[PDB]
Design a protein around this ligand. Sequence first.
Ligand SMILES: C[S@@+](CC[C@H](N)C(=O)[O-])C[C@H]1O[C@@H](n2cnc3c(N)ncnc32)[C@H](O)[C@@H]1O
Ligand SMILES: C[S@@+](CC[C@H](N)C(=O)[O-])C[C@H]1O[C@@H](n2cnc3c(N)ncnc32)[C@H](O)[C@@H]1O
Ligand SMILES: [Zn+2]
Ligand SMILES: [Zn+2]
Ligand SMILES: [Zn+2]
Ligand SMILES: [Zn+2]
Ligand SMILES: [Zn+2]
Ligand SMILES: [Zn+2]
Lengths: 220, 220
Amino acid sequence: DKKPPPYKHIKVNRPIGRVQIFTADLSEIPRCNCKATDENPCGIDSECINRMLLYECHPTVCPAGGRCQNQCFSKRQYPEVEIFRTLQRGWGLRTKTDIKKGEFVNEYVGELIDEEECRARIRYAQEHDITNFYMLTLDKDRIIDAGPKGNYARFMNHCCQPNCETQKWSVNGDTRVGLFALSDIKAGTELTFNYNLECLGNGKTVCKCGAPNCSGFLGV
Amino acid sequence: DKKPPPYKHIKVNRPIGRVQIFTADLSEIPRCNCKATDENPCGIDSECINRMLLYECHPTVCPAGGRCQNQCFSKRQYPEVEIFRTLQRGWGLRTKTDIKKGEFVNEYVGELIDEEECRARIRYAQEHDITNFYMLTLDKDRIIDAGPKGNYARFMNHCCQPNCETQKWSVNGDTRVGLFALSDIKAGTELTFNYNLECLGNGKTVCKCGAPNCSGFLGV
Ligand SMILES: C[S@@+](CC[C@H](N)C(=O)[O-])C[C@H]1O[C@@H](n2cnc3c(N)ncnc32)[C@H](O)[C@@H]1O
Ligand SMILES: C[S@@+](CC[C@H](N)C(=O)[O-])C[C@H]1O[C@@H](n2cnc3c(N)ncnc32)[C@H](O)[C@@H]1O
Ligand SMILES: [Zn+2]
Ligand SMILES: [Zn+2]
Ligand SMILES: [Zn+2]
Ligand SMILES: [Zn+2]
Ligand SMILES: [Zn+2]
Ligand SMILES: [Zn+2]
């Protein structure tokens, strides 16, 4: 209870076994029409077509060059966060800097596994009386398991009225799960999101989010 | 058992209650670089950027005009299919025409509902000893229920080695689930797909797909 159980802090998703990882030729990556002279080229308020489709601008082709603000996953531009111990929800994540509405908070990084491996790892965890799951569905047949290996995003708890959301983006021709702010978040505030249908294994865990509209479940 | 239980055969997804339905300005829709003179403009073999991102070309802007082959959802270009009675998997869908690998087969159409309404409808169905579910997750918080209202796609069974797959496309700025052929399908063959993580409510139903690699479950 002094420190969270050991995990491998990794920078990017790690395929495991028979999980495939797509990658894109420039042919397959869209090109925006921002200009280097725009106020915040490819920025959150811009009309960047790439941004609007949840695509990163690729740096070798973005007409805004080095000023492009649409590479938040690639450059890993995470606001400063600290792991803290909550009351009833185990370990939590909070921000040490102010975050503006819509700003990129983090990527949910971990091991990529299939239905069979995810089932296996859930069975093992139950038999050992484990209630902490880090499984988040990437697409129809791949699951992020931030349990063994992950980054700071793995400590973000569920809340039924959250202050961040997940968004599925395309980066170098593959899906990445991003956390983005639903509103302005003041420094020291806990970063949560609604698990909705995306997280697995939580089953009958009783929600302790403390939100007025709390369903008593972690999404489902 | 003479005919499948009654449903409302609808053409497009119907939001229910508090489910929101996004729509796009042309600002928010990507533009391809095909030419009207290309062999199959925006066709399955083309380098259409819209096609590669699973976006329809919008007809008012596609540089290929009326020759654009990337409007399969909007125009509803479904090969001819017939409902037939299977041995152990209830009602099934089969094609009456040859289908080529990668060709658009159908859209999975139905009522759009949230986690709460989907849970409710599953509880009711169990209490009435119902084993047929038509629930397929659209995105993180919306579910297609092709049960009450749907189209021919609702009769496609699960198979662990299927001949079609789902693809999530964007049409007029919202997600649509499409069925596409994994290989050439000869006329009279049953159209199936692997439910993977996408279908809900099936739980412990034993798979009767008849595939050599059959897991004995409908995806999970
Ligand atoms: C992604 S982990 C979050 C970090 C976790 N608290 C820890 O100690 O590492 C998700 C797990 O934390 C717990 N948890 C997260 N949000 C919760 C909530 N709102 N209410 C209760 N438990 C929650 C559940 O056990 C869940 O499986
Ligand atoms: C989308 S409906 C398919 C049409 C359904 N057979 C009918 O009679 O309307 C899915 C349901 O059909 C059954 N089903 C589909 N694929 C199956 C399979 N491979 N094995 C067993 N039952 C299956 C299950 O009861 C499932 O809930
Ligand atoms: Zn841009
Ligand atoms: Zn850019
Ligand atoms: Zn709650
Ligand atoms: Zn095109
Ligand atoms: Zn086109
Ligand atoms: Zn099977």
